[PDB]
Coordinates of all heavy atoms in Angstrom, one line a residue:
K1 N 34.9 5.2 4.8 CA 35.1 5.9 6.1 C 36.2 7.0 5.9 O 36.0 8.1 6.4 CB 35.4 5.1 7.3 CG 34.6 3.8 7.5 CD 33.1 3.9 7.3 CE 32.5 2.4 7.2 NZ 31.1 2.5 6.8
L2 N 37.2 6.7 5.1 CA 38.3 7.6 4.8 C 37.8 8.7 3.8 O 38.1 9.9 4.0 CB 39.5 6.9 4.2 CG 40.4 6.2 5.2 CD1 41.3 5.3 4.5 CD2 41.3 7.2 5.9
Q3 N 36.9 8.4 2.9 CA 36.3 9.3 2.0 C 35.3 10.2 2.7 O 35.3 11.4 2.5 CB 35.7 8.6 0.8 CG 35.1 9.5 -0.3 CD 36.1 10.1 -1.1 OE1 37.3 10.2 -0.9 NE2 35.7 10.8 -2.2
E4 N 34.4 9.6 3.5 CA 33.5 10.4 4.4 C 34.3 11.2 5.4 O 33.8 12.4 5.7 CB 32.5 9.5 5.0 CG 31.4 10.3 5.7 CD 30.1 9.5 6.1 OE1 30.1 8.2 6.2 OE2 29.1 10.2 6.2
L5 N 35.4 10.7 5.9 CA 36.3 11.5 6.7 C 36.9 12.6 5.9 O 37.0 13.8 6.3 CB 37.3 10.5 7.4 CG 38.5 11.1 8.1 CD1 38.1 12.1 9.2 CD2 39.2 9.9 8.7
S6 N 37.3 12.3 4.6 CA 37.9 13.3 3.8 C 37.0 14.4 3.5 O 37.3 15.6 3.7 CB 38.4 12.6 2.5 OG 39.3 13.5 1.7
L7 N 35.7 14.1 3.1 CA 34.6 15.0 2.9 C 34.2 15.7 4.2 O 33.5 16.7 4.1 CB 33.4 14.2 2.4 CG 33.6 13.6 1.0 CD1 32.6 12.4 0.7 CD2 33.4 14.7 -0.1
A8 N 34.7 15.3 5.4 CA 34.6 16.0 6.6 C 35.7 17.0 6.8 O 35.5 18.0 7.6 CB 34.4 15.1 7.8
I9 N 36.9 16.9 6.1 CA 38.0 17.8 6.2 C 38.1 18.7 5.0 O 38.5 19.8 5.1 CB 39.3 16.9 6.5 CG1 39.3 16.4 7.9 CG2 40.5 17.7 6.2 CD1 40.2 15.2 8.1
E10 N 37.7 18.2 3.8 CA 37.8 19.0 2.6 C 37.1 20.4 2.7 O 37.6 21.4 2.2 CB 37.3 18.2 1.4 CG 38.4 17.2 1.0 CD 37.9 16.2 -0.1 OE1 37.5 16.7 -1.2 OE2 38.0 15.0 0.1
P11 N 35.8 20.5 3.3 CA 35.2 21.8 3.6 C 36.0 22.8 4.4 O 35.6 23.9 4.5 CB 33.9 21.4 4.4 CG 33.6 20.0 3.8 CD 34.9 19.4 3.6
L12 N 37.2 22.4 4.9 CA 38.0 23.3 5.7 C 39.1 24.0 4.9 O 39.7 24.9 5.4 CB 38.7 22.4 6.9 CG 37.7 21.5 7.7 CD1 38.4 20.6 8.7 CD2 36.6 22.4 8.4
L13 N 39.4 23.6 3.7 CA 40.4 24.1 2.8 C 40.2 25.6 2.5 O 39.2 26.2 2.7 CB 40.5 23.3 1.5 CG 41.0 21.8 1.8 CD1 40.7 20.9 0.6 CD2 42.5 21.8 2.0
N14 N 41.3 26.3 1.9 CA 41.4 27.7 1.8 C 41.7 28.2 0.4 O 42.3 27.5 -0.5 CB 42.5 28.2 2.8 CG 42.4 29.6 3.3 OD1 41.6 30.4 2.7 ND2 43.0 30.0 4.3
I15 N 41.3 29.5 0.1 CA 41.3 30.1 -1.3 C 42.6 30.1 -2.0 O 42.6 30.0 -3.2 CB 40.7 31.5 -1.1 CG1 39.1 31.5 -1.3 CG2 41.2 32.6 -2.0 CD1 38.4 30.4 -0.4
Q16 N 43.8 30.2 -1.3 CA 45.1 30.2 -1.9 C 45.4 29.1 -2.9 O 46.2 29.2 -3.8 CB 46.1 30.4 -0.8 CG 47.5 31.0 -1.3 CD 48.5 31.1 -0.3 OE1 49.6 30.5 -0.3 NE2 48.3 31.9 0.8
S17 N 44.8 27.9 -2.7 CA 44.9 26.8 -3.7 C 43.5 26.3 -4.1 O 43.4 25.6 -5.2 CB 45.7 25.6 -3.1 OG 45.0 25.0 -2.1
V18 N 42.4 26.6 -3.4 CA 41.0 26.3 -3.8 C 40.7 27.0 -5.2 O 39.9 26.4 -6.0 CB 40.0 26.6 -2.7 CG1 38.6 26.8 -3.2 CG2 40.0 25.5 -1.6
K19 N 41.3 28.1 -5.5 CA 41.2 28.7 -6.8 C 41.9 28.0 -7.9 O 41.3 27.8 -9.0 CB 41.8 30.2 -6.8 CG 40.7 31.1 -6.1 CD 41.1 32.6 -6.3 CE 40.0 33.5 -5.7 NZ 40.3 34.9 -6.0
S20 N 43.2 27.5 -7.8 CA 43.9 26.7 -8.8 C 45.1 25.9 -8.3 O 45.8 26.3 -7.3 CB 44.4 27.6 -9.9 OG 45.3 28.6 -9.5
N21 N 45.3 24.8 -9.0 CA 46.6 24.1 -9.0 C 47.4 24.6 -10.3 O 46.8 25.1 -11.2 CB 46.5 22.6 -9.0 CG 46.6 21.9 -7.7 OD1 47.5 21.1 -7.5 ND2 45.7 22.2 -6.8
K22 N 48.7 24.5 -10.2 CA 49.6 24.9 -11.3 C 50.8 24.0 -11.6 O 51.2 23.2 -10.7 CB 50.1 26.4 -11.1 CG 49.0 27.4 -11.1 CD 49.6 28.9 -11.0 CE 48.5 29.9 -11.1 NZ 49.1 31.3 -11.0
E23 N 51.4 24.1 -12.7 CA 52.5 23.3 -13.2 C 53.9 23.8 -12.6 O 54.9 23.2 -13.0 CB 52.6 23.2 -14.7 CG 53.0 24.4 -15.5 CD 52.0 25.6 -15.7 OE1 50.9 25.6 -15.0 OE2 52.3 26.4 -16.5
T24 N 53.9 24.8 -11.8 CA 55.2 25.5 -11.4 C 56.1 24.7 -10.5 O 57.3 24.9 -10.5 CB 54.9 26.8 -10.7 OG1 54.1 26.6 -9.6 CG2 54.2 27.8 -11.7
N25 N 55.6 23.7 -9.7 CA 56.3 22.8 -8.9 C 57.0 23.4 -7.7 O 57.5 24.6 -7.7 CB 57.2 21.9 -9.7 CG 58.5 22.4 -10.3 OD1 59.3 22.9 -9.5 ND2 58.7 22.3 -11.6
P26 N 57.1 22.7 -6.5 CA 57.9 23.2 -5.4 C 59.4 23.3 -5.5 O 60.0 24.2 -4.9 CB 57.5 22.2 -4.2 CG 57.1 21.0 -5.0 CD 56.5 21.5 -6.2
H27 N 60.0 22.4 -6.3 CA 61.5 22.5 -6.5 C 61.9 23.9 -6.9 O 62.8 24.5 -6.3 CB 61.9 21.4 -7.5 CG 63.4 21.5 -8.0 ND1 64.4 21.0 -7.2 CD2 63.9 22.2 -9.0 CE1 65.6 21.3 -7.8 NE2 65.3 22.0 -8.9
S28 N 61.3 24.4 -7.9 CA 61.6 25.8 -8.4 C 61.3 26.8 -7.3 O 62.0 27.8 -7.3 CB 60.9 26.1 -9.7 OG 59.5 26.3 -9.5
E29 N 60.3 26.7 -6.5 CA 59.9 27.6 -5.4 C 61.0 27.6 -4.4 O 61.4 28.6 -3.8 CB 58.6 27.3 -4.8 CG 58.2 28.2 -3.6 CD 58.1 29.7 -3.9 OE1 57.7 30.0 -5.1 OE2 58.4 30.5 -3.1
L30 N 61.6 26.4 -4.0 CA 62.8 26.4 -3.2 C 64.0 27.1 -3.8 O 64.6 27.9 -3.1 CB 63.2 24.9 -2.8 CG 62.2 24.2 -1.9 CD1 62.7 22.8 -1.6 CD2 62.1 24.9 -0.5
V31 N 64.3 26.8 -5.1 CA 65.4 27.4 -5.7 C 65.2 28.9 -5.8 O 66.2 29.7 -5.5 CB 65.6 26.8 -7.2 CG1 66.6 27.6 -8.0 CG2 65.9 25.4 -7.1
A32 N 64.0 29.4 -6.1 CA 63.7 30.8 -6.0 C 63.8 31.4 -4.6 O 64.2 32.5 -4.4 CB 62.3 31.1 -6.6
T33 N 63.3 30.6 -3.6 CA 63.4 31.0 -2.2 C 64.8 31.4 -1.7 O 64.9 32.4 -1.1 CB 62.8 30.0 -1.3 OG1 61.4 29.9 -1.6 CG2 62.9 30.4 0.2
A34 N 65.8 30.6 -2.1 CA 67.2 30.9 -1.8 C 67.5 32.4 -2.3 O 68.0 33.1 -1.5 CB 68.1 29.9 -2.5
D35 N 67.2 32.7 -3.5 CA 67.5 34.0 -4.1 C 66.7 35.1 -3.4 O 67.2 36.2 -3.2 CB 67.4 34.1 -5.6 CG 68.5 33.4 -6.4 OD1 69.5 33.0 -5.7 OD2 68.4 33.4 -7.6
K36 N 65.4 34.9 -3.1 CA 64.5 35.9 -2.5 C 65.1 36.3 -1.1 O 65.2 37.5 -0.8 CB 63.1 35.3 -2.2 CG 62.3 35.1 -3.5 CD 60.9 34.4 -3.2 CE 60.3 33.9 -4.5 NZ 59.0 33.2 -4.3
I37 N 65.7 35.3 -0.4 CA 66.3 35.6 0.9 C 67.7 36.2 0.7 O 67.9 37.3 1.3 CB 66.4 34.2 1.7 CG1 65.0 33.8 2.1 CG2 67.3 34.4 2.9 CD1 65.0 32.3 2.4
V38 N 68.5 35.7 -0.2 CA 69.9 36.2 -0.4 C 69.9 37.7 -0.9 O 70.5 38.5 -0.4 CB 70.7 35.3 -1.2 CG1 72.0 35.9 -1.7 CG2 71.0 34.0 -0.4
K39 N 69.0 38.0 -1.9 CA 68.9 39.3 -2.4 C 68.3 40.3 -1.4 O 68.6 41.5 -1.4 CB 68.0 39.2 -3.7 CG 68.0 40.6 -4.5 CD 67.2 40.4 -5.8 CE 65.7 40.2 -5.7 NZ 65.0 41.4 -5.1
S40 N 67.4 39.9 -0.5 CA 66.9 40.7 0.6 C 68.0 40.9 1.7 O 68.1 42.0 2.3 CB 65.7 40.0 1.3 OG 64.6 39.9 0.3
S41 N 68.8 39.9 2.0 CA 69.8 39.9 3.0 C 71.2 40.4 2.6 O 72.1 40.7 3.5 CB 69.9 38.6 3.7 OG 70.3 37.6 2.7
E42 N 71.5 40.6 1.4 CA 72.7 41.3 0.9 C 72.9 42.7 1.6 O 74.1 43.1 1.9 CB 72.6 41.5 -0.6 CG 73.7 42.3 -1.3 CD 75.1 41.6 -1.4 OE1 75.3 40.5 -0.8 OE2 76.0 42.1 -2.2
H43 N 71.8 43.4 1.9 CA 71.9 44.6 2.7 C 72.5 44.5 4.1 O 73.2 45.4 4.5 CB 70.4 45.1 2.8 CG 70.2 46.2 3.8 ND1 70.9 47.4 3.9 CD2 69.4 46.1 4.9 CE1 70.6 47.9 5.1 NE2 69.6 47.2 5.7
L44 N 72.2 43.5 4.8 CA 72.4 43.5 6.3 C 73.8 43.4 6.8 O 74.1 43.9 7.9 CB 71.5 42.3 6.9 CG 70.0 42.4 6.7 CD1 69.3 41.1 6.9 CD2 69.4 43.5 7.6

């Protein structure tokens, strides 16, 4: 029932990850996010 339920939700997924998974990990995306914000906001 969870798999048939899963197969009822999986058709709803989107291209931004349906194309690929990667080894890059979220930890590094948070660490990078800090700099993306700080380097953009140094101006203000």
Side-chain angles (χ1 to χ4, degrees):
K1 315 320 165 187
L2 282 166
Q3 183 73 349
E4 188 164 22
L5 172 54
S6 192
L7 293 159
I9 288 159
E10 285 172 54
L12 312 175
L13 292 168
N14 207 347
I15 269 51
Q16 200 182 118
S17 70
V18 161
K19 285 191 174 188
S20 62
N21 265 241
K22 295 187 178 178
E23 72 280 14
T24 57
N25 77 59
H27 172 81
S28 74
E29 179 62 35
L30 289 180
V31 172
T33 292
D35 284 357
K36 290 174 195 179
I37 292 160
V38 170
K39 191 177 66 70
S40 301
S41 59
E42 176 72 350
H43 162 55
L44 293 165

